[PDB]
DNA sequence: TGCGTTTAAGCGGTGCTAGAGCTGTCTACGACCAATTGAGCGGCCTCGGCACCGGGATTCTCCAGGGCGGCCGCGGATGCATTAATGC
């Protein structure tokens, strides 16, 4: 099983971590950076999607 | 813009201590590689959401007729000029 499931995170911690590793950012990356990044992206995406869905539903649309 | 004044920074100088800066040490702690499988992903075919127009109710804008105080066409005078029969 992946850490995202045991941490209840929808976004992939492993994918973010491997993006950071090959993203020429720092040679040493702690385990907290990928989980923090996944959490913040999940929060931002959730808020944006909720607002967009509100804007869609107030215009008689389901998309 | 110009002036009297007054509240006030700029400045010379001190004693420190909370705090910035360089240095061993080990101890957490991640870099890297067999090995797997399981979730991300390529492809597909459909029905429900969506695109666009119809029929009226509704809402919006915009048209003209009617009662308000000043008008510019006209007619006649009666003077300016002309004119013809007659006394001289």
Cβ of A22 near strand B (under 7 Å)? The reply is no
CB A13 within 8 A of CB A32: no
Cβ of A61 near strand B (under 7 Å)? The reply is yes
Q: Three-state DSSP class for A7?
A: coil
Resolved by: cryo-EM
Stated in angstroms, how far is A31 CA from B51 C1'? 50
> What are the Cα distances from residue A17, in Å, to A9, A33, A41, A46?
14, 8, 13, 21
Length of chain A equals: 63
Q: Which two tokens stand for residue A54?
A: 């509100």
CA distance A26 to A28: 5
Stated in angstroms, how far is A22 CA from B21 C1'? 34
Smallest CA–C1' separation from A28, nucleotide: B30
């Amino acid at each position: 099983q992946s850490r995202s499931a045991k941490a209840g995170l929808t976004f992939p911690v492993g994918r973010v971590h491997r993006l950071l590793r090959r993203g020429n950012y720092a040679q040493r990356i702690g385990s907290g950076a990928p989980v923090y990044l996944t959490a913040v992206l999940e929060y931002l995406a959730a808020e944006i999607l909720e607002l967009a869905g509100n804007a869609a539903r107030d215009n008689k649309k389901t998309r």
